[PDB]
Design a protein around this ligand. Structure first.
Ligand SMILES: Nc1nc2c(ncn2[C@@H]2O[C@H](COP(=O)(O)OP(=O)(O)OP(=O)(O)O)[C@@H](O)[C@H]2O)c(=O)[nH]1
Ligand SMILES: Nc1nc2c(ncn2[C@@H]2O[C@H](COP(=O)(O)OP(=O)(O)OP(=O)(O)O)[C@@H](O)[C@H]2O)c(=O)[nH]1
Ligand SMILES: Nc1nc2c(ncn2[C@@H]2O[C@H](COP(=O)(O)OP(=O)(O)O)[C@@H](O)[C@H]2O)c(=O)[nH]1
Ligand SMILES: Nc1nc2c(ncn2[C@@H]2O[C@H](COP(=O)(O)OP(=O)(O)O)[C@@H](O)[C@H]2O)c(=O)[nH]1
Ligand SMILES: [Mg+2]
Ligand SMILES: [Mg+2]
Lengths: 426, 40, 43, 427, 68, 52, 426, 427
């Protein structure tokens, strides 16, 4: 009916997508072999949003795996639920970028994007009414940010009407995986501010904080982090996939969250997250969900919400719940913290309800908050970018591949003016 | 000095027949509405 | 059910080995004769 | 994802002897050459039941090459891969670079071309040599020059063995090292120094072997190389290929000289005595007492750092350790690089060789960092090259075998320019 | 010799995909003068008949220029 | 039913391909055995001259 | 009733015809020894088109195998399905072509064409209602290009009204199987544009591309390519041999595909062609068939069809289906690609349906596309021809046998103004 | 189909002995002459169970012919086929061309006529000889002239052994070679050079035979000829006959000189160590050091190449290897031909002989190519012919036997014209 295709870029994208597809396949009740074995008939009615029926109850995902090195694809394929991905969708290079935005966006892109575009065009024309594209990647790498970014630009040029989600894992100062993180991130944000429809900003330090303080785990592996991200994505698409009291699709969320076209960078959380012993000590009520959903130590980005103003907010609820309590909680939260909400938009919050909770849970919620506290992150990345670029460090690896300094200057200009507009609206 | 395997599939008990022309598949002997005698 | 004759339906054996052998039979030839010769096809 | 290694010189091919024993033990290949596809990045499988390494040992003294030919790994190595000459360069850069190099480099390149042609996903070449000698210096430099001009942009990882500051074996090694580094500047992508007294100190102190030989040194070098290619060989939580070091450790085209270090290096008794955790192994990898190069970064500024983790390692605690290292001001970074770290993690712990000296551990770390104490090392070397060059000692040799004074002057001034380079960059 | 564009197969005929791994021969692909200038391009149409710039038995005529 | 028939054909083809691969391995082993048995260096018409 | 007389020329023609006859024998259910063993009598109804009853269910192919060396025929007869061919149909040559168009067209033809024409005339007048001739050969070889070409000329002179199909395999620069490829191909096409009615262009480059991108085989020997071509021509002629809802014969296809008398060079494709690892992941529907049909990766020519405009297209379907889905897919694929179809011809696609799919398949399709992209390969052959002809390379082997260089000049002029008229019509 | 082989001289009949031993082993024919129909192209069947080779060994010294007559193949060869003279030419082209050739050529031609009208589908003639001698040069050229005037259009392949550049077993061999080539120019249709020194280098390098004799050279020449003619006897996916090379390998009527190479020439140990597939055997075929003529294709430009493949070979990988060779910049073609390759494939793998040196392989490749390196060889030969003819050395022998200086002058001018032809054609 309404169709979402998935595009996974880089190692981070491939691993997050592997966990996401495991979660979604379990939710729709299909075995790791790929056949359907669900109980309720509610699972069949909306599997087409992610899967395609092949032969006698065999469903394959509508996903495009994409990187430049065999290793991540082999790791994904070896594991369980790795037998459901169609081999024709493994668009795949042989050399490797190496955290080089120029390599992943100008040299290897020019020779891989033909196959990438052919695969995505086939997969987007196979369905009848495409809802939008959903891309998963990180902004620090070369083949994840560069390749995925060029694909985003071409897709926006080709299909300029359909929706677009970008789950982007940005860097944070404390642990910096690559020395060229700001060089990559500034250019990626340059392209995202003009091509992407909406972006969900994920942060590894925030995920570590969640798994350390909240979950109280001992070894919070990337499997756990990717599972949290997959839960967020599934909660985003739950309203499309299942019937609800107050339906809300991706376009509805975008139009109710974005007041101006350049402000489409959201900060995301998920509830409930309780510690392994404190699960029994807590209640399962809408107030208990919202009093953790609005918490600052629960969001999945390194941006304090109380340093700025909530421009808009969105709450997606799951479970047999009461709209009276949902609306009352939203109004009470908005009224108590009267200074963190922008003045010229009454009822900054959009809320929706679905009647199918995640498996094993009675009730759940997801939060998408478009605030003006993300310019903190933008300024923090911009300062490091300017700090290296003023002295021309690590610049030859980009210059000797086709890029000029005008690209860097214009990316800096766009990042700076986006910071300025977030500041003025604050 | 110091993998998933699947069993092979079996042919269906009901073998499909490809020799089904549309004419012979849609035009078979049919009967209906036996004649009714006139009333008095 | 015999395996059908379709493009993707073939096993891959080494080309060098064959039970029958790779001798090229002279079943089709000419008689020496004279400046005009005769084609001969032998069973 | 195949990477090929070439060993130039008596030191290079002994390091190869250690490394290939380690690789055979890691991939479970008997020395006869067959197991009783992770191997595919080092060994190529010929036909049925035989794996041959992707390497060439090239050297001029035949003694060690025939030692290899008649040792235990007689059948593992392809006969053509073992290249041997008839006479040495005799610690003469000119002799090994102009006279015999021009005769042997052609066959060396001819075999390297065949290896690369057989390769499918070539990551790059990596060279093993000691600059103090004559063969590995002269024809090593010549081979690097021609390989660079033939392939252009492929990653050439040079694990060079520089002479120690005080411990020495020759007298012309300042000349050889200067004349080799001058050509190494413009052709090697990534270069890693390895001094011998540093490894001697490591073995004496941590591995408590009071009378070590070159075998232990080569074993530690092989451990380092295995840790550095473990990401390609085995899957991990955050894997890394060889290409990323170029982009993440070389801020300027001439500054590629990095300090390798490894931790833990502990005995079978200290292993029983102490536990090994990510925090303390990261802390110990920053000590001068566990470095493979005899220099102190206490006077330097860390331009960049790459951390490779093997074994029972999760991302949270390595993030915590890196964060604490950054927050504390004990070590300081160049202010043009706040993002000076690069982490990578792999699942397989390092293996242990029978007859070795290391105990098996849960986790290990290999650091490849870039700083300015290397700039100190180059000036210290220039001192003792300058002393002997003042009176033109030993230079009659090089002139006779075919060099001139212009090359000496240009090499020395290139090293001086490199000194000024480092001085300005560290500001 | 020259390598003409295939328009369907040149992606698989890329030099790296053929395990060459050194700097490839660019003369064969640049002496062709495609419309785009790269190996993905269309040739220029030709018209008329070609004259004999050579004499018999492969000897160039005096008028036509040649490399020494 | 048609899908199942195609699956059966594919499985039969895969089994026969496995048999062919086993034949290939046996062939390689056989030629190596022949090389080691009769093609060895010390069995030549010039071994007397080229003897070590 | 309508009769197709088969002709095989050269090595490639002989092998292709052998595979074609094996496939047709399997399809019609006649065993290699030559006896009918079919299940349904739908096969018996149209066996006269390819076979003649000899003695008690003994059917022999209506084919003539012809070349200048019996070397290939010896292997063809020694292989399976070798006893079916009548011994009288073989034609022998003792000298050999030696890859010389002159040797195949002026010297050996002058004495072997009488015998081949006698055989062809006897076989064509044995039947009562002839439909046409179908000749399979090459454009690079000597006895396949030249001698088959002169046979084409003679047959057109004798029987001008009957249909003629010419399956010709053309050379490519990358697959340089011979050195005089331009010299043979240019003159062969110069004769074909004036004699042949319609030519199917084939090439090993596209054959390899198909068998590695769709089939994903490991060791595709020439048998696989010959099987592909055989299945293609069988799908072409299936309408003559089996009843269908909307029949389309050779003349109908030619008149629906040829707008102008000189525009008779088509590119062909076959579908479905799926790997054995993807036959479990895919389905078999008309949209799936059409998507693979219109993909340029399934084409069998060294010319990307999207480099130009589709003049006409034809789709022959096999299997039980719905005409509504068939024609809606045709209309959709024609309207979505508004730039690849000519403007002054509405409804560029002609479709036909037959109710008998190939054995083992539920549904199949065949595509014949008369586009303007074939001028790309024509230019790539013409420029090679000019480059060689400028400096008399290998010209003496042709000059010393009788022909003039006016031959080369006129062939060049015809091929050049033909590509010019393609460019004009594009 | 039939093709017949004629051998002229000491080299010709010895390589013929080796080639016929290989043919009998290939077709399973006992040395008696009967099996315990592909033989029809080489052996005519007489009566019941008897195969007579279609060849003639003709020479002037009775010793080497009587060696064959009393060898193990007494019953294989028909007695009349072995033509033998009474006195040698003694390394004198003129003596063998005017004084004994005029007496032996009539009988040789009669025997050739009998063989030709015995055979039915005659593919052609192939000649074996060494141009450095007297018998193989003089009366060999005379016999080729008479064959050209008798048949003309039929293919006459030549496998001729030119004198080596520096390794020499004669003195007047420049005179003999020049005077033989002057007549070979317009009578031989396709000629293949074979150099003893190049074959010596091949045996030393690849077959690691330190001191090979002429038998090994003859054995590998037999392997080459069998590999290039096996398509007539064994069915293959893409077969090829003798007439093809005429059209696809000779761009101009007087440029017919072909460099030949074969791969793999690999011993039993390196065969066990190394995998032999299409890609690397194709690369070894084009590798300059594996050419059986002592010259270098890098100095010149390729005109055309012909690639015979035998054994387990599919078309896709040979096509891919050809594409890789085309895209490689190491070798370059002339600016004429964008399609300079001719491939052929045969199913039958090469056979092995007991006591030989070539290990059994799954696949093999024979390349026959054309370039201007032939022009370089001719220039080298011309220089050392000029050195001798400047001072009128050894001329009195020829003058006394009966020729004159006109032949010398016209041959020298013809060779100079050949050099000019190569120079202009390669432009
Ligand atoms: N770390 C380490 N260094 C070695 C080893 N073997 C030799 N070296 C060093 O190599 C330097 C001399 O070069 P060698 O490898 O011995 O010989 P070479 O490089 O071929 O130079 P020539 O003797 O002139 O031919 C000495 O200064 C040693 O420090 C070894 O096994 N380990
Ligand atoms: N490759 C190879 N060359 C040979 C062989 N025998 C002789 N030759 C060559 O033949 C040249 C001398 O000529 P021969 O063939 O031996 O004798 P000839 O041709 O009959 O000339 P005369 O001495 O007049 O009888 C030598 O330079 C060798 O290079 C052989 O067995 N193998
Ligand atoms: N959440 C999550 N983040 C990841 C994962 N793998 C990598 N990352 C993040 O991605 C960043 C680097 O990604 P990178 O290796 O450059 O991706 P590439 O473009 O394929 O090279 C690091 O900062 C990691 O925090 C994963 O599995 N899950
Ligand atoms: N698809 C296919 N093509 C072939 C086959 N045999 C030969 N060819 C093609 O035919 C061309 C050579 O033609 P050739 O046999 O010399 O023609 P002839 O000399 O007239 O018999 C080559 O370019 C091959 O691509 C085959 O079995 N299948
Ligand atoms: Mg040494
Ligand atoms: Mg002699």
């Amino acid at each position: 009916m309404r169709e979402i295709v998935h595009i996974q870029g880089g190692q981070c994208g491939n691993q997050i997508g592997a966990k996401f597809w495991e979660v979604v396949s379990d939710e729709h009740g299909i075995d790791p072999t790929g056949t359907y074995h669900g109980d309720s008939d509610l699972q069949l009615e909306r599997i087409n949003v992610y899967f395609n029926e092949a032969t006698g109850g065999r469903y394959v995902p509508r996903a495009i795996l994409m990187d430049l090195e065999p290793g991540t694809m082999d790791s994904v394929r070896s594991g369980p639920y790795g037998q459901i991905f169609r081999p024709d969708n493994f668009v795949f290079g042989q050399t490797g970028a190496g955290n080089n935005w120029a390599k992943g966006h100008y040299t290897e892109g020019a020779e891989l994007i033909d196959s990438v575009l052919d695969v995505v065009r086939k997969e987007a024309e196979s369905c009848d009414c495409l809802q939008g594209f959903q891309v998963c990647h990180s902004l620090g790498g070369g083949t994840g940010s560069g390749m995925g970014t060029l694909l985003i630009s071409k897709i926006r040029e080709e299909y300029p009407d359909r929706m677009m989600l970008t789950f982007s894992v940005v860097p944070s100062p404390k642990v910096s995986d690559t020395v060229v993180e700001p060089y990559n991130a500034t250019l990626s944000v340059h392209q995202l501010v003009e091509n992407a429809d909406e972006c969900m900003v994920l942060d590894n330090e925030a995920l570590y904080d969640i798994c350390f303080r909240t979950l109280k785990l001992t070894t919070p592996t990337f499997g756990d982090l990717n599972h949290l991200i997959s839960a967020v994505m599934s909660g985003i698409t739950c309203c499309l996939r299942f019937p609800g009291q107050l339906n809300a699709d991706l376009r509805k969320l975008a139009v109710n969250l974005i007041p101006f076209p350049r402000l489409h960078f959201f900060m995301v959380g998920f509830t409930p997250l309780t510690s392994r012993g404190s699960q029994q000590y807590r209640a399962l009520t809408v107030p208990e969900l919202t009093q953790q959903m609005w918490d600052a130590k629960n969001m999945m980005c390194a941006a304090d919400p109380r340093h700025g103003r909530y421009l808009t907010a969105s709450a997606l609820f799951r479970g047999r719940m009461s709209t009276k309590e949902v609306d009352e909680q939203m109004l009470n939260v908005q009224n108590k913290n009267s200074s963190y909400f922008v003045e010229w938009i009454p009822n900054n919050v959009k809320s929706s309800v679905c009647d199918i909770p995640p498996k094993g849970l009675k009730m759940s919620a997801t939060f998408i908050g478009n605030s003006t506290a993300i310019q903190e992150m933008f300024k923090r990345v911009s300062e490091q970018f300017t700090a290296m670029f003023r002295r021309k460090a690590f610049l030859h690896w980009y210059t000797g591949e086709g890029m000029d300094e005008m690209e860097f200057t214009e990316a800096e200009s766009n990042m700076n003016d986006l910071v300025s507009e977030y500041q003025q609206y604050q | 000095m110091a993998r998933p395997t699947r069993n092979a599939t079996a042919p269906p008990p009901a073998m499909p027949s490809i020799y089904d022309t549309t004419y012979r598949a849609h035009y078979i002997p049919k009967e209906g509405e036996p004649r009714v005698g006139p009333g008095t | 059910p015999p395996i059908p004759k379709l493009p993707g339906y073939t096993v891959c054996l080494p080309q060098s080995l064959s039970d029958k052998g790779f001798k090229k039979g002279q079943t089709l030839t000419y008689v020496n004769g004279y400046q005009r010769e005769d084609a001969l096809a032998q069973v | 994802r195949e990477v090929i290694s070439i060993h130039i010189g008596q030191a290079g091919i002994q390091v190869g002897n250690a490394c290939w024993e380690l690789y055979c033990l890691e991939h479970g290949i008997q020395p006869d050459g067959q197991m009783p596809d992770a191997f595919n990045t080092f060994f190529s499988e010929t036909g049925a039941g035989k794996h041959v390494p992707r390497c060439i040992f090239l050297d001029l003294e035949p003694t060690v090459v025939d030692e290899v030919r008649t040792g235990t790994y007689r059948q593992l190595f392809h006969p053509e891969q073992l290249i041997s000459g008839k006479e040495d360069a005799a610690n003469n850069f000119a002799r090994g670079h102009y006279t015999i190099g021009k005769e042997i480099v052609d066959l060396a390149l001819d075999r390297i071309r065949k290896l690369a042609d057989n390769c499918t996903g070539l990551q790059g070449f990596l060279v093993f040599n000691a600059v103090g000698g004559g063969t590995g210096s002269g024809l090593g430099s010549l081979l690097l020059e021609r390989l660079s001009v033939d392939y252009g942009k492929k990653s050439k990882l040079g694990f060079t063995v520089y002479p120690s500051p005080q411990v020495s074996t020759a007298v012309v090694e300042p000349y050889n090292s200067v004349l080799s580094t001058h050509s190494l500047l413009e052709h090697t992508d990534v270069a890693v120094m390895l001094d011998n007294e540093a490894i001697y100190d490591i073995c004496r102190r941590s591995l408590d072997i009071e009378r070590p030989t070159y075998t232990n040194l080569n074993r530690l070098i092989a451990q380092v190389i295995s840790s550095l290619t473990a990401s390609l060989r085995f899957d991990g939580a955050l894997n890394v290929d060889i290409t990323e070091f170029q982009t993440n450790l070389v801020p300027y085209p001439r500054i590629h000289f990095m300090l390798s270090s490894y931790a833990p290096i502990i005995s079978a008794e200290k292993a029983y005595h102490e536990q090994l955790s990510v925090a303390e192994i990261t802390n110990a990898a920053f000590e001068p007492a566990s470095m493979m190069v005899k220099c102190d970064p206490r006077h330097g500024k860390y331009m960049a750092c790459c951390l490779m983790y093997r074994g029972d390692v999760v991302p949270k605690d390595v993030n915590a350790s890196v964060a604490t290292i950054k927050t504390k001001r004990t070590i300081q970074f160049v202010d043009w690089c706040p993002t000076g770290f690069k982490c990578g993690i792999n699942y397989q712990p390092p293996t242990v060789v029978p007859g070795g000296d290391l105990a098996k551990v849960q986790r290990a770390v290999c650091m490849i960092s870039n700083s300015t104490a290397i700039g100190e090392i180059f000036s210290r070397l220039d001192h003792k090259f300058d002393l002997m060059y003042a009176k033109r000692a030993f230079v009659h040799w090089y002139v006779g075998e075919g060099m001139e004074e212009g090359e000496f002057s240009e090499a020395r001034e290139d090293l001086a320019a490199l000194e000024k380079d480092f001085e300005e960059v560290g500001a | 010799s020259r390598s003409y564009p295939g328009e369907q197969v040149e992606h698989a005929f890329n030099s790296k995909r053929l395990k060459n791994w050194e700097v490839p021969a660019v003369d064969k692909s640049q002496a062709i003068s495609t419309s785009t200038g790269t190996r993905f391009g269309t040739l220029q149409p030709r018209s008329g008949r070609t004259q004999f710039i050579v004499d018999d038995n492969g000897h160039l005529k005096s008028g036509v220029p040649k490399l020494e | 039913a048609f899908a199942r028939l195609t699956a059966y054909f594919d499985d039969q083809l895969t089994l026969m391909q496995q048999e062919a691969d086993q034949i290939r391995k046996a062939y390689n082993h056989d030629t190596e055995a022949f090389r080691q048995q009769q093609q060895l260096k010390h069995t030549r018409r010039e071994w007397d001259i080229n003897r070590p």
